[PDB]
Amino acid sequence: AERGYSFSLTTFSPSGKLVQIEYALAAVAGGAPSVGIKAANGVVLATEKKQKSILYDERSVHKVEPITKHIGLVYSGMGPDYRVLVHRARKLAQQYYLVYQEPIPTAQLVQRVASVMQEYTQSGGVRPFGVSLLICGWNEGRPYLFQSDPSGAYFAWKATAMGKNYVNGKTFLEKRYNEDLELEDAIHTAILTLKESFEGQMTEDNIEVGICNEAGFRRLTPTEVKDYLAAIA
Amino acid sequence: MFVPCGESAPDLAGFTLLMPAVSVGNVGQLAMDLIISTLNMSKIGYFYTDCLVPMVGNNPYATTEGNSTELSINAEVYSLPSRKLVALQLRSIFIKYKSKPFCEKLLSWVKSSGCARVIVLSSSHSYQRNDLQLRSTPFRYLLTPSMQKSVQNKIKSLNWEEMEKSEFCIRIPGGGITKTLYDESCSKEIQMAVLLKFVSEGDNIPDALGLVEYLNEWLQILKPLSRWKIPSSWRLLFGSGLPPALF
Amino acid sequence: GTGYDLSASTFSPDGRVFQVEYAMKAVENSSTAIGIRCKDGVVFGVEKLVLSKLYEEGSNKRLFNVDRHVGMAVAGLLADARSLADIAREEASNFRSNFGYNIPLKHLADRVAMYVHAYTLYSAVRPFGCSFMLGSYSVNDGAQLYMIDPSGVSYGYWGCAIGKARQAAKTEIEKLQMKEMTCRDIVKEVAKIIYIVHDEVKDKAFELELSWVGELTNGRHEIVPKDIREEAEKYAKES
Amino acid sequence: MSRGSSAGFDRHITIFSPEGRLYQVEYAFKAINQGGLTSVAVRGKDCAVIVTQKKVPDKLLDSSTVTHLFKITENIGCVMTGMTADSRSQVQRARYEAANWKYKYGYEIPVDMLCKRIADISQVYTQNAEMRPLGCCMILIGIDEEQGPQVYKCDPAGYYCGFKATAAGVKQTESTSFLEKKVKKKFDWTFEQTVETAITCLSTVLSIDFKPSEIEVGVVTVENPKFRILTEAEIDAHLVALAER
Amino acid sequence: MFLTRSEYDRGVNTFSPEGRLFQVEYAIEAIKLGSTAIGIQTSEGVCLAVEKRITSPLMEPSSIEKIVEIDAHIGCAMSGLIADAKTLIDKARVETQNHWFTYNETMTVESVTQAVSNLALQFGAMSRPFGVALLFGGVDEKGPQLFHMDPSGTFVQCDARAIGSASEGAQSSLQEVYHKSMTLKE
Amino acid sequence: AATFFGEVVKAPCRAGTEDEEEEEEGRRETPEDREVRLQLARKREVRLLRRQTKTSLEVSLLEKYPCSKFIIAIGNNAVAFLSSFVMNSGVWEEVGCAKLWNEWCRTTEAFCVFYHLKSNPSVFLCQCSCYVAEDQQYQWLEKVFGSCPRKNMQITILTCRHVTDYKTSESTGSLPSPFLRALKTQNFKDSACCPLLEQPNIVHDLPAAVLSYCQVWKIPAILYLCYTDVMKLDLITVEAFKPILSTRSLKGLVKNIPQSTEILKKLMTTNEIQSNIYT
Amino acid sequence: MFRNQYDNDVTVWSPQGRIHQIEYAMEAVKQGSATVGLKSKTHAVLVALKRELAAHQKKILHVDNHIGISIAGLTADARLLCNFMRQECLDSRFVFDRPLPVSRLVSLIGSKTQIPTQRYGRRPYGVGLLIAGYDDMGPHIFQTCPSANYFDCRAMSIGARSQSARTYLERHMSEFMECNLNELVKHGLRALRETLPAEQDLTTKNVSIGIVGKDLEFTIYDDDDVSPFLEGLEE
Amino acid sequence: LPSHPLELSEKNFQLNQDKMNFSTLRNIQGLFAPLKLQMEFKAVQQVQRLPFLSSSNLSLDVLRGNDETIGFEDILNDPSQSEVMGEPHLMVEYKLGLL
Amino acid sequence: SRRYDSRTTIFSPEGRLYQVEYAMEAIGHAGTCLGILANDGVLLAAERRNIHKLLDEVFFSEKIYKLNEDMACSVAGITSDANVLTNELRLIAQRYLLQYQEPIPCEQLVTALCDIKQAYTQFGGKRPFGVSLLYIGWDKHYGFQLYQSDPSGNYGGWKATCIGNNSAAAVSMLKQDYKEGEMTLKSALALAIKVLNKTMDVSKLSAEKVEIATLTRENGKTVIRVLKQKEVEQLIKKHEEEEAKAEREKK
Fold first, then answer.
1. Which chains touch D (3 or more CB pairs under 8 A)?
2. Closest Cα to residue G169, out of G196, G149, G189, G142?
3. Nearest residue in I to F2, CA atom
4. Where Phosphoserine occurs, residue numbers (chain A)?
5. How many Å apart are CA D83 and CA D132, to the nearest integer?
6. Inter-chain contact F7–I7, Cβ cutoff 8 Å?
7. B123, B126, B142: which is closest to B211 by C-alpha?
8. Contact G187, G172 (CB under 8 A)
9. The CATH number, out of the four listed (2.60.40.10, 3.60.20.10, 3.10.20.30, 3.40.640.10), of the domain defined by the range A3-232
10. Is the Cβ–Cβ distance between B192 and B119 less than 8 Å?
């Protein structure tokens, strides 16, 4: 059972496990599917937004949000924690830009946000942010894709998936994803991955796509994702 | 060890011992008190063993003034030959390292007397519960392999859920005597059904009523449907009154 | 919620804060404290259970006045009642100092209720075990009566009660109609209800304290005159 | 917290469960249900509308005092469903946030911003051990300069997503179904149409045709962009219109 | 009708049903766990004695001294947790030093013991009751004076007191042999 | 605990089932743990002996010496009353002493010495000013009686309790504090001399052990509950035991009230000081 | 029975809506020694029954020029309360140049002792104070129950065996008003002796008397000083 | 005296900001609002990194409403990159108030 | 043993702190990381354990970090905590360099970070980091050095060490095949790759399972570098060929 260790965040299990962080990652895994693909021309951040009801207004919370002109991200898990961390990410990006007059590299921003989350993962009295950030961006003529975890550990990725059936999503990405893979069809690959990890019917209002190329990050409009869905099927 | 109130011990062959397993509060003991009061079981003897902390009062179920002056002790044995039931009543905490000795003593006692089932009324912790356990239901059960097929199928037809097993082990968080008693009964190869309810400490009278109803679903020792008479001793279950100066 | 009543910052399986409910029951642990709102103003009465004759008359009184025009009848933890009376005094004083006029009963009641709610929110402290009801009268404001609970909800009433026999006094007030007579007629009703809901067998003796505010008293809270207070007691004895 | 962290997966706000469930936030939603009432807010072409059933439990209780519709700022209006004291405290918090926004940025806060700030506060409450989520559900309304009508549900978990039509309370799901059916047949919801749709949604989910004193209608319109709580006679007229059709 | 467990002895801010702080009494008896100091006050002066316990022959008895000096006219004997007695007597020394510095006089034994008690009152600074008792035997302008400090935090006037292991027996013998008209040598 | 902010804590358990389960999980105990546990058990060991050579009797007082009655006193007030009113009646020479140790008692002013009138050797007295732990209570029982009864002795157990423990419908501070109750076994067919203890009120500790042993083994016994508000050898509390002098117990073992109460004041006034924790 | 969960912390309500820690503090004051307080038209008198070799405790204390107190509970919280009372009176006489009213001081102590009950990490002040005083409106005899709420009393007693003293004071509650200082003190001594066992009679080393009067300021009387009153005191 | 007129103005800028905020709330809302805000700030500050590391204080800024605002204190001198650092135990003791 | 492990600040009857022991167990759950001192320099043969087919290589190194001009270290434990710990290492080194304008001696930096970790162990409410770092570097005083700290702050000097997975076997076999004062960086890398081969039984050395660093002194400058994929492939091939030749000789 090892319940005393299950409840407490600041304790190590006899085997040496931080169970609270494991449960935060379980919350992440129980979130909405989110697939990110690092193409050659740019990157894709596609996910399955939970605004499928007609009442849910479109011009509202967006699953994919920008931090800078050249960086954006998507999450899987807790919306509130995601939004708070997005605010912190924007704060850090502005700090870096005012200190160096340089666009914050994606890796540096990922480091800063991951350290912020590790801060609450370390001390007792709070809980790990039950959300993982699929942060993308573009620097020095190169696409970027990173994955942050409630533990505060972060890794670089070429194509990764989150949420439900996320292991199946990663298997599908490994099946399909190619290193040479270019943009405008990596979007198709992400659409197909989310379809493989979908529940219901695929509609332009059931997904939220954001790509970042040389131009920069840009949340795709319903029309664009509708066109991509029509091209897929 | 069993010590009759009179000169001889009345045989308990073909009976079923109903057990309070001291656990999380007194849910099992309160359920046993409810059962003894409702069935109006008469004290048959004292399970005089040095494992329980000694106490002495008066008969908890006293209905007449004559019954109110009947000295009681920590462990008292009651029986109802009409239903062939035996109701041991532990009314005390256990002593360090004496729980498993008590389990061995009681299981040997029931083996010798002839009681077939040692059905235990116990409890577990309403926390340390999985999401499924939290969502599903508090009541659980556990039947040793020696359990007869007929009653096992009766319980299955009642559609009960069995205590979660964590090979696995029979774990009852906050059960104490419960787990070891079940293990030693399985070793003895004598029948027992460990009925329990996931509960948190506090006012557990409703929990005791729920547990006795859970048992009634199976044994139907009461008309299946205030129905469960409470001991006359149930009173001042939050201490004395409040002082006049305050409030 | 046996496992969810140990802290005020924890919800029950169905969304209840049992600490606040236990505070509301601690309110019931105290004797009744009635108050009826008339068109002329309000009249306050309390089933003040006498503790001992050693205590000087006026000891541990129940009918406070946090402002010149605001009364306060309480029922529950006496210390908490005094604490919230002091809080209301400070709030009214600052309101008069800054806004320039006497704090409206509504504003004062809301401020104190939100203070009580602040206390019920965090796990550092516990909810107030007391409950009270304010009353005021002004030429412009008119008759006003509010009641604050341990939860911290400030609802307005045309007459209500708090304490052991709260429900019986509430039903008697419902049986009574209050907005077509003056305070001099509702004081007798208050006394009658307090006597009716009082239990002699359970409680040997009790003292009935009466206070009111209205056009009768020129919009000020005062203790009912002994002559009128005795007459109200006499009416209560009659019925 | 002062006493520490409660014992068990679902007993303390901070600690997770095996799936990572914050059961205490779900119990805050259960408290919103405990409120006992149902509220329906409707967004439309001209008017953003908020309607709820107002209960005066006893005759002695002053009907004027009891209310579940509050005004935060001239533009902003809201209906609270859930614990009464928590609702009032969150309304005060929203007013404080709006005042702070006006001071900092010079111009009045929009609806979505007030909800987002309140949701951030709620997220902090969930994160920490000392505080607990408030058992109330805020449904803001207002006329945005760019969009116009704006109805935003605003939850203890801190989910500020806007809406074309919002419901809350004990009959939340039925109201959502009825309003989804209504919007699927969108009819250019005018002020009268919006008010009638909200009133009839409440009367259908609760299955009771209300008296004007049994409900509280609040409307903010493009013509009148300041929050306005309808009076007894006006709600009576609206109910008569509903009865006629 | 059921014997149960209730634990009021873990926490100095918890009252037992009888209204008793078990932590303070546990400190009181923890003093008795130590060695006994025989304090006596007479009109001719006050004497302080103690049974200092030398654990091994290699130990230096100078370092284990239980009787200390807080001022020229003030003295006390320690018994119990000597580590906390360090802080207690340091506070007393500081107080008497500031008195000599400011008023250029002698602090009364009652005053210095009151100050060090004010230090000792802080528990629940210390987070637990002080586990050591002192016998402030001094001769101030007022005259010979014996006092006692306890984990309770407050002092008490005394003329004949023994505290530590076999404190009861030492006190019985002291009251057998002590009389008001005795001399300091006696 | 609540040592720091987010310290996860657990509620006190009435049943103490967690401690029992820990004690029932000793199947994987280390040899050093077992050795130290047995040393603790040896520490917690009552030892009945004769002070002639401080040597264990190796037999219960009942078995060794015939017993016709054994008045037990458990508590400072009970032992004071029994040492004042009874010991002036005759000689009461010592028969043996029990040496027990626990966190709240020592081997001796924590004594459990026994006596017998020595004019009637069958009548015995016990002076248990110490406290006997739950694990040591049955050990004391088998060391003083031997688990085999005589069924022919009047076991009069005396104890002092706090009125706080006594539960009542009204406030616990609204009782005639110095009052005494009774609890008697099946065999005991004598007048209680006082009101019997209420139902929800139960007793524990050594007196409960003795009374339960007498009930199980059919020995006429009575246990007296002297409830008080002060437990510092006050005259009121030990005069609350006065009524039991009239009843059969201590009926022929009492010499004269005035002599007892005269020395009773000396016993009350010769006690020590309880530091300066209260006033 | 079921109160163990809710009887250990002072910031938790029981299912019966009670804080048992406050009741346990009120029991702690009860377990303390018995003291008596009563006032005449012109005097407020405190009489306390002290605890063998070694000096006794100071139940009677001079907290201020015209305010005095008697302690019947824990010594530590009593010392802190006395310090706070003395500081308040000193500050009043220093800044406002006003003898701090006894009732105002009692209200301050009520709030002070209310603080811990609603705060975690603290315990209620387990002490009962019989505060004597005289200013403006004649003498002032008060009683601060360790539960913050307090009472004003013409006569009072608190401690162990204090019920007998309370009963005797009730027997003559009205007489004290029309009594000379001497007679008031003797009534106090008789009330104290009610608490003593029938065998014991009041001595000089087990009695301290605190007296504040119209012209008189509060003073503590020792064995020799209390002997006058004990000389003449009817048995 | 200070090294500059702005020295104390910005040494205690935040202190004055909170002081004025609470004063205004007390004057308008009442006693409850400052109490509540103080409680939330205290609760969030109780839990963070030890003083010898750089705490994020994320949730504290979220409550304060400056989690999406930048000031000169954010950029000019960075506490995350300090030039002189004390011993860990020493600074933890200082924070606890032992020294 | 289900007691005295609720907090890091609580002792057991034996005088044990179980929380730091569980942190060391968590270290044991990490990946193999070697460090071998040599005459020419010092190396850090770590296990990449980045074997997903959709993983990027946008970073300097996963296991291996650089602290200053004179120091480098590996990590075996919790990555999230290791990141902040390495940041602290860099910051401390730069603080010392700014104050004294000389590179921090390796032992001083090791001890400072051990102070950090043992301070988190000391005070309640804080979780011990649970990261074991394998430090290497050069300084004027003790030349090339090899250090190894644990979650509890206990650090030791080493000629060859291992942390993470199969650490005990790796250390035993290192001391079975290590010469004091004779090993050159060449033979040091050979021994490191041999130990990795014989410890990492999950798969054969594919040159991406392995991440070896090197720290030498050329022109009086500490040259911290990482073996190229070609270099580690050559190491693996040399070791495998030598093992095959030895097997052939055994016959």
1. A, B, C, F, G, H
2. G189
3. I125
4. 6, 13, 15
5. 13
6. yes
7. B123
8. yes
9. 3.60.20.10
10. yes
